[PDB]
Automatic annotation (TrEMBL), chain B:
GO molecular function term, any single one: mRNA binding
Annotated organism of origin: Acinetobacter baumannii
Domain of life: Bacteria
Family classification: Belongs to the universal ribosomal protein uS3 family.
Record gene name: rpsC
Biological process, per Gene Ontology: translation
Protein purpose: Binds the lower part of the 30S subunit head. Binds mRNA in the 70S ribosome, positioning it for translation.
Keyword annotations of the record: Ribonucleoprotein, Ribosomal protein, RNA-binding, rRNA-binding
Gene3D superfamilies noted in UniProt: 3.30.300.20, Ribosomal protein S3, C-terminal domain (3.30.1140.32)
Official protein name in the record: Small ribosomal subunit protein uS3
Record's keyword annotation contains Transmembrane helix: no
Length: 100, 215, 50, 136
RNA sequence: GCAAGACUAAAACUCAAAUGAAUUGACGGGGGCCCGCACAAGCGGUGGAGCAUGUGGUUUAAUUCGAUGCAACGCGAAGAACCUUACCUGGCCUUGACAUACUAGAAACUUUUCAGAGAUGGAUUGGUGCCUUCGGGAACCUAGAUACAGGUGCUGCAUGGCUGUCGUCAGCUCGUGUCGUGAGAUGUUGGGUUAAGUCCCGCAACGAGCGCAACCCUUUUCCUUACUUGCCAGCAUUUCGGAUGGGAACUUUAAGGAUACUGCCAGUGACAAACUGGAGGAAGGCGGGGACGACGUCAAGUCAUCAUGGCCCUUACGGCCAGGGCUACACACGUGCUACAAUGGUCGGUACAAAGGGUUGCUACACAGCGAUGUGAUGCUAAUCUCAAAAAGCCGAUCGUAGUCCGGAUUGGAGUCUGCAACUCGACUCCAUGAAGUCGGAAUCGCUAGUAAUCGCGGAUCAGAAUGCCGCGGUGAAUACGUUCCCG
């Protein structure tokens, strides 16, 4: 991937980490029954007023080695191209060729 | 056609893994990434130390890296100063204290990685590729190997059309899963591009299975 | 396995997680101390519950 | 198969009458693994013909199948004993479907009863076959 | 010489070759031999319909870029509302979002606001941190300067690495002797047999190595160890629920082992390799399946995973943002899903799996709703709790061949959930509507047994979004006379 895309993902991750507590508090207040309807509406507006990158749906899993955005395999954190190379030379513990 | 990786196909038969630790699904990815970073840093830092195998282990909240080298003196230092450094940067890269252990290779000519690195370094100095392959094969066969195969691919000798050459002496039974085959790949960067080098060394079959390999 | 396009050319990998259970009853005073003094082998995770 | 000659598969007799002819007829009737439905149809037909005429179902079925059984097929060629039974069951299956009784078991029982006395659509099919056969 | 022409017969100029025989390979619209779901024999599909998905074309501001006979077309993509995103419109930055090298200043940061579509810009708070030889150095930020950074821009026909294909096709090589002036040849050659250059007889040759087979995984029978979170044969108590005391038998779980070797018996081949039949045995001649792909072919595929020679841009072909597009639509093709019904539709009652997933997760149970779902609440970091209802199946009733009580496209209305946000462009629920379709031309595809056919279940990707892909089990067939013909 281009270096700009990797820096973009890094920036989005940092923003998500920064705004994590306030967003959780806002959603809890929204889902709080005991709070007044006015309070819930104000919390909804506050949650809608956050920066877009604060939301975690805009994060895309990329290969930890090359930044490829397709074929991720969350368990290893590597795209398929690097996963094949690293597995077949013995650097991934416990992974072997499967036959049955 | 294409050929399977000689170590990958034997990883569960007569070969061990270069990584030996356990992690739950949450920590597995983080551990793997830090291990790969450690391997890359070590490979970059110890080019001239004849380093072949790096084994990473995580016993319990710590790290242990075993480095197999043919020049333990360069890795260790005149008073062991460099091992303290290596531990410092490895503890920085990982998140746990790390111990560095040294494993001397007393037969450098039976190690596939070192032979490939020697051939690549020679090719990077405009040495004739046929001469380099023949010398490497002769030295390995004299060191007591049962067979060796060496292959070079690319713009050999500066030619505009790339081609693949290979030379072999002895036996290399790749289809036998219990054969002890060491395999290595290394690239040499010349002014005309990249030349790939592949080395296979056969050291005899392994009888008794993985149980006798003592997994 | 191919860099660009061969959907039927794939490598199939597996990883297995083995689990063992051990029960110790009527432990002698030396038992807990010896178990804690036992070394930690790499590649095996050990959990103890009292 | 060019070189290898393959043995013919051996099938088990049906649990009720121990008749491989009944088992093979059930196999011909069955679609996409619904052997239970095939058994229901065949056993219902046999019970129906038995209550109509007090005669052993195995004997009645074999006599009727021999009656419908072709010595030649359809452009004439020759056939072997196995093909004879295969084609007899094949032609017997369809006419029951084109009949008009409310259930397949009743339809097949009626078709067998009509073919036994010679006024059956399978009998007409065999007649077409042999009146085609004398052409050559 | 009637003629057509015959006979005798040069030079200028031009090239560094033109030739003969034999050797190795390659090729042939030359020959011979064999094998393969190649054809035959069967079962079920496609081409016809509606919808899903990919492609061509057309359209567009853009419809981003690759893959193109078999071997591209549910392909990269294991999952495009924003993001992804690479494309378009418009708004912005320029040593840069990111590295090293130099010169200085600043803890880093932190609270409220305003303008703006946002990128950005302007005000406004609090903090002012760490180590010391403490005269400054560690982190992070800001400012200036130039070598540079950056480029999913071009060349896969300059490359590495990786992959497809012939094709699981059966071949490919080496030593000492002999023959030839020589390049080279012999060995690998013929007769049987085999999945096999597998093996045996023949053979100026004898011997090897890699290919084949085996070693590896899984399934079928038995044994040992192990007895919980799993099991319940015997005993006892039962709230009749392994629920409880209890048992270690059985099922299972999962490590290590045993067993099959033509071993035995009866004939053949040849006096062999082999072949045929029988008993025992869970299994008999390779028991089934997976992984493993020889020397080589196609300037095959990938500079858009990555690396890399060369070329090109540098206030732009680099970088940031909001909206749009990749989802268009007179058409054509590929791969699929659902049907056309009675071996079926609907309704009521009632049985039997395997494998896999679960802590920002799966959820018992109760209440509310017709429902998607919501609220409260419980167990589970799991042989412990949970997803979970298996479905086809069996019993009973009804429908009685109708475009139907078949089919479920399309459209109107009303909702739930994920998400900052479902207009372009999500999934699901309810009411209403009820299209084509009555078995599909020339032609064409898959499959030889727990297979085809049919039925349900799970996972990767993933906030949400599978008829695709990768797996799991249930029910469970038909036919193979044979090698003419078609293909390789
Ligand atoms: C009759 N109708 C016309 C005729 O005879 N003409 C002439 C004529 O006699 C004469 O010629 C003159 N004198 O005028 C002769 C030679 O002199 O040739 C003749 N012609 C010819 N034609 C012939 C030819 O070609 N070859 C062979 C021979 O036959 C030749 N003679
Ligand atoms: N789009 C842009 C693609 C450009 C491409 N990159 C140019 C390229 O690579 N040129 C190569 C190159 O000069 C060299 O090849 C290697 N390997 O350096 C040479 C050696 O033969 O061949 C040329 N290629 C050739 N193709 C031709 C062929 O077939 N006949 C006739 C003659 O034109 C042949 N020369």
């Amino acid at each position: 991937a281009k270096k700009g895309m990797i820096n973009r993902e890094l920036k989005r991750e940092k923003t998500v980490a920064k705004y994590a507590a306030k967003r959780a508090e806002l959603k809890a207040t929204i889902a709080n029954v005991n709070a007044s309807d006015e309070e819930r509406f104000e919390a909804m507006l506050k949650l809608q007023a956050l920066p877009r990158n604060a939301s975690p749906v805009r994060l895309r899993n990329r290969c930890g080695l090359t930044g490829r955005p397709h074929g991720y395999f969350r368990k290893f954190g590597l795209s398929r191209n690097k996963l094949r190379d690293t597995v077949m030379q013995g650097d991934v513990p416990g992974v072997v060729k499967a036959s049955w | 056609g294409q050929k399977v990786h000689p170590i990958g196909i034997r990883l569960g038969v007569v070969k061990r893994h270069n990584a030996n630790w356990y992690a739950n699904p949450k920590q597995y990815a983080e551990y793997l990434l830090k291990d790969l970073q450690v391997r890359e840093f070590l490979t970059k830092k110890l080019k001239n130390a004849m380093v072949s195998n790096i084994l990473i282990e995580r016993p319990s909240g710590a790290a242990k890296v075993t480095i197999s080298t043919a020049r333990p003196g360069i890795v260790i230092g005149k008073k062991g100063e460099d091992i303290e450094k290596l531990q410092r940067e490895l503890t920085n890269i990982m998140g746990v204290p790390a111990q560095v252990s040294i494993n001397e290779i007393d037969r450098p000519d039976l190690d596939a990685r070192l032979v490939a690195e020697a051939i690549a370094s020679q090719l990077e100095k405009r040495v004739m590729f046929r001469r380099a392959m023949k010398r490497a094969v002769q030295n390995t066969m004299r060191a007591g190997a049962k067979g060796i195969k060496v292959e070079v691919s690319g713009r050999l000798g500066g030619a505009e059309i790339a081609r693949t050459e290979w030379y072999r002496e002895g036996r290399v039974p790749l289809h036998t899963l219990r054969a002890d085959i060491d395999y290595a790949t290394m690239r040499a960067e010349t002014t005309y591009g990249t030349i790939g080098v592949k080395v296979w060394i056969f050291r005899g079959e392994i009888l008794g299975g993985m149980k006798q390999v003592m997994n | 396995t191919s860099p660009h396009v061969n959907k039927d050319a794939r490598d199939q990998y597996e990883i297995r997680t083995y689990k063992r259970l051990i029960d110790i009853v009527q432990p002698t005073d030396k038992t807990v101390d010896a178990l804690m003094k036992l070394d930690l082998a790499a590649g095996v995770d050990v959990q103890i519950a009292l | 198969p060019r070189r290898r000659v393959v043995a013919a598969r051996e099938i088990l007799p049906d649990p009720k009458f121990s008749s491989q002819t009944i088992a093979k007829f059930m196999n011909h009737v069955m679609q996409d693994g619904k052997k239970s439905i095939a058994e229901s149809i065949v056993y219902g037909a046999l019970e129906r013909v038995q209550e109509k005429n007090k005669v052993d179902p195995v004997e009645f079925f074999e006599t009727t199948l021999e009656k419908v059984r072709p010595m030649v097929e359809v452009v004439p060629m020759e056939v072997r004993p196995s093909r004879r039974t295969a084609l007899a069951m094949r032609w017997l299956v369809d006419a029951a479907a084109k009949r008009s009784e409310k259930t397949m078991a009743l339809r097949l029982a009626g078709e067998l009863l009509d073919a036994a006395e010679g006024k059956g659509a399978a009998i007409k099919k065999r007649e077409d076959v042999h009146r085609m056969a004398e052409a050559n």
